[PDB]
Amino acid sequence: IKNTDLIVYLLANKFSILNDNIIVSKFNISKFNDYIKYINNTNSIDTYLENQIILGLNNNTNSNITKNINTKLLNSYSNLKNLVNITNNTFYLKKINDNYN
């Protein structure tokens, strides 16, 4: 690799994160101390607010296969309106008469 090209690539990658001073922490989660420090330092609120980003385990191929919902089973249970009432994804058992003799 050419030195100038490598330097340009490194500078571009460094400045892509932010055109301002940044703080980078390197952790090896396979190690106990590194893992504890990494979990202690990573906060979900910062990640959501975009003030912090984690690089190293992208795994961007997280798009699932859109698990199909059991529409047939849901309709079958809905048809039984004398036993179960469906509301807000909740199945309420209609009170039955234990004394039926």
């Binding site: 699932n64 919902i69 059991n70 849901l74 994804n89 909740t90």
Partner: protein, 80 residues
């Protein structure tokens, strides 16, 4: 409090299911040891990771909630 936590947007039906993993039929033209090594490498390369992925998907889908659009389409939820 987390003990009594509950998630009501998950599907309420059982998530147990069957997955088909095609086998490698025994090849008489190879021999006992060659077929055994073929089976071992198949288990280490395709069967084992496939089952691990299936189990991980089963574990994660039980936590992944159902979207509002999916709920509306299934009729489980009515807006307003």
């Amino acid at each position: 409090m987390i003990a009594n936590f509950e998630n009501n947007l998950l599907p309420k039906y059982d998530r147990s299911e069957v997955h088909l993993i095609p086998k490698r039929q025994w090849e008489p033209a190879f021999g006992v040891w060659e077929n055994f090594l073929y089976d071992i490498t198949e288990y280490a390369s395709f069967i084992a990771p496939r089952g691990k992925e299936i189990a991980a998907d089963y574990q994660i889908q039980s936590a992944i909630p159902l979207t509002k659009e999916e709920l509306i389409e299934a009729g489980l939820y009515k807006e307003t």
